[PDB]
Design a protein around this ligand. Structure first.
Ligand SMILES: *[C@@H]1O[C@H](CO)[C@@H](O)[C@H](O)[C@H]1NC(C)=O
Ligand SMILES: *[C@@H]1O[C@H](CO)[C@@H](O)[C@H](O)[C@H]1NC(C)=O
Ligand SMILES: *[C@@H]1O[C@H](CO)[C@@H](O)[C@H](O)[C@H]1NC(C)=O
Lengths: 321, 157, 321, 157, 157, 321
């Protein structure tokens, strides 16, 4: 007669690592890394992301005519943009402080677009003729929808003196621009006056832009350049334009409504018709693992990202062979 | 293992004990079988559950990459931004992998420790009555009736 | 007869945590987190902090007339500024590269203020009349003390050509500015000439400022703007001004004396009449704990800051119940 | 505990031993009492003091936030600055909390280890003379006179 | 040491065992000498080699300073850059120093654990035949012939 | 008769540390920190570093005449520059966006220098006379080799209109500059016209520089200033200059050939005539230790840098005394 102390074995095949030994076989184990996504872009908590397709944030905000999809967008969860979106800045140039604006967009969930200076508000200048081959729409030459390319009326560009007061309760993103022609004859052809300027004023802004003449390579068949600036007009604050040419003038501005945490993710992917609680640039995540290894940039209720290939905790004991 | 029991003087585990993690095998005239030691098993289950949750918990404070873009003439701050985001990921990857490695080894040792302790608890009861065979088993001087229930009991002699 | 091995219990109530078990009761324990401050701003090692009250570093450095408290300050340990100090930039505008200057102030313990261009040094221009409603002093219109608002003398603003050589052995913080009027008639009223400039020169500096005209919102009842620039004039180096108007000219500059490690902390708090060896924005610290959890930004001999609520080391053994 | 002594086969501590951390209780015709084992107690005190100082020491190299300000159009570098300062604080908070957790558990195990070792040191002396009761106590075959001093001594038989 | 063997009940090591890390000293009529226990020695060597390599391995993911320069009016980002580079170095210096400290202590304990286990493996064979002297040695009831080979063997009685 | 369990001692003197005890003596130990370098600058994997001696990257790239050593350099492994190189910018000024360029150099292993606008290409302007006392060569006044100091021809500075198209397959670093004189009479003496400009154009660049007049301290015996700009001209892209004076014009540009990972290290040290697989600013490293403590900035197959003084792992057991 005999009594024995002993312990559990089973038919487990699960292995875990220790400092002193690798692939120890254990009775029980708890894998804590999520390794699987669904490879789609999904709604986040029911809320759909703004998917720019071939449009850049710039293409969207200025209203490139090929970006008609995003003329009026509902509230979004997060924004997706490609690495190299084609429909950006159709008339070539720059967007001043673009990245800082993109940064601001990351704390924004809804813009409501409103008209601040009506296109048919211009008495002394031509406003229907500010178009280009670089921004085609339905075959014909067209321009960014949100800004007005002002031109001389019957050979005269009189000084413009326009003001807009923010009666809204929401911060206003206000967008404008300046045109840099290639030579003096272009300057005369559109605006007449040889030297011009645009001054922009607000409580905090003290701006004066001046056209930069240079001969340059045709980007998109144009050698001219548009350079776009912006400001956040506070409530009860007035923006003051004054200019004698080259002025690209606001028609529409964006009310900032319902700003909430959000991000712009970079992804060649397209919308997936799904819902998720945690999204990544490569796909969405559904898991209760404390960690995942999918991609560092997530948004939502997400597990923590690590660069591991494997994280498995022993819970049972060493399984005998 | 540090405690010498598991895959030590006790050569291997038991497929026949599906009952819990540690216990007894008895064998006498009336037959033979396995019974799990409820107390040490339950102590062990709590130890490990708590550990796991502690491990998960300490790991939720952790770096969260935020996307940021930089123009063509900000290559230095973009590189700064990159090396910072990667650095915190390397630090947390290292943290999690090591913690796992170290705590796995403490987990296997803890089970080994629980087996030895349970063994000793039985050694301390049978002290001259049975012969300590050397393999996890004690062989009785006097035949033991299903007396066994009493070794498992904590109440023997 | 019986001998027993055993161990200590006591009536300890102290608990510590382990990986496998929480609130284990121990005979002895060592709490290593400092959780207590005094909630005051105190002298640091006898040395008093510069407390700006309602003044900003800008309000102080330019000598806003409401910042008379800080006309001549002794050596400080650290500087305290509120989140939103009221007495800043009374005449509206900007302070060029302000943050970089604040950064420099963090390696500075004492400024000694000295006159570089005497106010009664101006023959051909009016110097007593450069005042404004935006900077009142004792009811009457006044201006930043340290800089001179130069105006035309009997309808003429002749070119100014002034130089100052740093004979001192200490680096010199030199401060100046430019005025941007709202319209052409303001330009004429104060300076006469229609287009002006200010050029500033030194060994390393190559500056030319030009007035920016715009109509803008009244901030502090003024639509004009002052924009302040600065340089660190090296020893044995000469600063060279030349300007035909809009020039706000230095009267005083600051010798950098006794620069030592220091910081600007943000705090709504006021001076506490105490001494300390370690100070935080919320209060001072007196402790021998290796860690504290008070605030991340400290100065002095300080414990290390952690975000814990509890750090207690077991020293005794598990206390029996 | 891994060593099975503290709150193990020795059920609980002694309010009556104010003397040191581990020792003896003796009981015979002449009476009874507690005496601390000076050597193991002192070894234990050094172990733990050194540990604490080592813990404090390794912790003084640590991130020190420096205040930095950024204008309205430097929102990205300000955010960079923030996430960097927080990241190092999360890394050091995690460091200190874990080190505490792990070292606390090694501290309790070390005391358990010291009790078992002291017990074994006495088991190894009384080997057939007294009956190993199973509870931390040995019951003598031959009556022991204040003979006790000799068990504690290291010099018995 | 936690296991009580090394510099414990076994007072010191043996200059005369150049053979391996743990083993036996025997002494009888035919003479005396040292022989290493091959199995436990080899187990120990693998344990430690693996540990070392694991230690080296986990340490190659680590921050790598990249040089970056900043003009006279970028003092804030230069300081940001500096505190970031130093912070990651302090975090990795702390990592390596601690890992070394902790793993060194597990290494010494592991050897102590291996000695105790080997001792117990011999205690469990000689159980009533020899007298457990208390110093790592067993003194035989019956004279043992070079019988010794059989204790070392695992095959005795 | 007696058999004993026991363990190894030896005559080891090696000590290691634990959490609970310092300087424990062990039978065996493995030191894992490399503490030794050779204190030289060596070739990296056979490949020699570009050692600028007393030249700065600027001195090199513009071709300061004292930097003749580096007129045509082979492929390098890494670059070494002193803390304060003497031969930099001999004619005083600035180098626009210098640090960003240095950053670019860190991803560059070979430049091949080629002539884009031949010096004897200038018909209407003087090109042999653009020299200065600030840049001497062999005693006589000389100028940066790579750029041409254009001057008026017989009292006329006609507008320059020059273009260069990148026919090469490699990106082109293109370098140019502008001159800022001290007074109006200097402006007339060299270029005649009172107000000038330089416009630079490319696919992406839209530049117009304008001379900044100021009286300033003589740095290197000159009060004038050169300010150097640069661009990376993409392949199949054209750079377009236009200017009526102050224009410092490119003669040579650099093809970017064989860009590979590399760095600029700062070191007062000089070349060592050695080879290495891992280099630091203080010396090279030859070791199989997983860590070293030499300097944080290395390049090559390198051990990991830590700030330790000691890292020694126990391998044997505690050696008895
Ligand atoms: C540059 O020159 C190449 C070679 O002829 C030509 O193919 C290319 O189109 C040119 N680009 C421009 C912008 O002139
Ligand atoms: C802007 O318009 C609102 C509405 O009348 C007015 O109350 C506010 O004072 C105006 N602000 C300025 C600067 O004109
Ligand atoms: C500045 O004045 C000092 C004192 O005479 C003189 O030695 C120094 O050379 C001057 N520097 C300049 C640039 O004028």
């Amino acid at each position: 007669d005999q009594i024995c102390i002993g312990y559990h074995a089973n038919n487990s095949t699960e292995q875990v690592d220790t400092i002193m030994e690798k692939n120890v076989t254990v009775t029980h184990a708890q894998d804590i890394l999520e390794k699987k996504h669904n490879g789609k872009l999904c709604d986040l908590d029911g809320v759909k992301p703004l998917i720019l397709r071939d449009c850049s944030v710039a293409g969207w905000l200025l209203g490139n005519p090929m970006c008609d999809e995003f003329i009026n967008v509902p509230e979004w969860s997060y924004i997706v943009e490609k690495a190299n979106p084609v429909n950006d800045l159709c008339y070539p140039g720059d967007f001043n402080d673009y990245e800082e604006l993109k940064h601001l967009l990351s704390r924004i969930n809804h813009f409501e677009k409103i008209q601040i200076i009506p296109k048919s508000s211009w008495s002394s200048h031509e406003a229907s003729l500010g178009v280009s081959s670089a921004c085609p729409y339905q075959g014909k030459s067209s321009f960014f929808r949100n800004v007005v390319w002002l031109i001389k009326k019957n050979s005269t560009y009189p000084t413009i003196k326009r003001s807009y007061n923010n009666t809204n309760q929401e911060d206003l993103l206000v967008l404008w621009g300046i045109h840099h022609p290639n030579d003096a004859a272009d300057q005369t052809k559109l605006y007449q006056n040889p030297t011009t300027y645009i001054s922009v004023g607000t409580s905090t802004l003290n701006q004066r832009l001046v056209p930069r003449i240079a001969t340059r390579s045709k980007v998109n068949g144009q050698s001219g350049r548009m350079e776009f600036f912006w400001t956040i007009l506070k409530p009860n604050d007035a923006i003051n334009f004054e200019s004698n040419g080259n002025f690209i003038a606001p028609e529409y501005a964006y009310k900032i409504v319902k700003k909430g945490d959000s991000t712009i993710m970079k992804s060649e992917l397209e919308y997936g018709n799904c819902n998720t609680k945690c999204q990544t640039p490569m796909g969405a995540i559904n898991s209760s693992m404390p960690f995942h290894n999918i991609h560092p940039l997530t948004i939502g209720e997400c597990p923590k990202y690590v660069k591991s290939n494997r994280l498995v905790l022993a819970t049972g004991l060493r399984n005998s062979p | 293992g540090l405690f010498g029991a598991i895959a030590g003087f006790i050569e291997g585990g038991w497929q026949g004990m599906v009952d819990g993690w540690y216990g007894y095998h008895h064998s006498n005239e009336q037959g033979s079988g396995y019974a799990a030691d409820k107390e040490s098993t339950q102590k062990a289950i709590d130890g490990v559950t708590n550990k796991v949750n502690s491990i998960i918990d300490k790991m939720n404070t952790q770096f969260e990459a935020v996307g940021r873009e930089f123009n063509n003439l900000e290559r230095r701050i973009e590189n700064l931004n990159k090396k910072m985001e990667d650095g915190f990921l390397d630090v947390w990857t290292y943290n999690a992998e090591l913690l796992v490695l170290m705590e796995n080894e403490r987990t296997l040792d803890f089970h080994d420790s629980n087996v030895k302790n349970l063994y000793d608890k039985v050694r301390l009861q049978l002290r001259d009555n049975a012969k300590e065979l050397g393999n996890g088993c004690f062989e009785f001087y006097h035949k033991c009736d299903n007396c066994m229930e009493s070794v498992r009991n904590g109440t023997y002699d």
